[PDB]
Amino acid sequence: GIINTLQKYYCRVRGAICHPVFCPRRYKQIGTCGLPGTKCCKKP
Numbered sequence: 549g550i551i552n553t554l555q556k557y558y559c560r561v562r563g564a565i566c567h568p569v570f571c572p573r574r575y576k577q578i579g580t581c582g583l584p585g586t587k588c589c590k591k592p
Contacts, residue, residue: 554578554579554588555579556579556580556581556587556588557579557580557581557582558579558581559578559579559580559581559587559588560578560579560588565579565581565588566579566580566581566583566586566587566588566589567586567587567588567589570585570586571585571586571587571589572589572591574592575587575589575590575591575592576589576590577589578590
């Protein structure tokens with residue numbers, strides 16, 4: 549099968565591991581990716 553142990557540098561593997569373009573605030577950090585300013589966030 550396909551695992552999914554999102555950590556940060558690659559937290560999540562889909563359309564976008566981290567917010568596209570950038571990352572807002574208050575979201576809910578779930579793992580920051582190399583991208584400077586792009587982390588695993590999900591709008592409220």
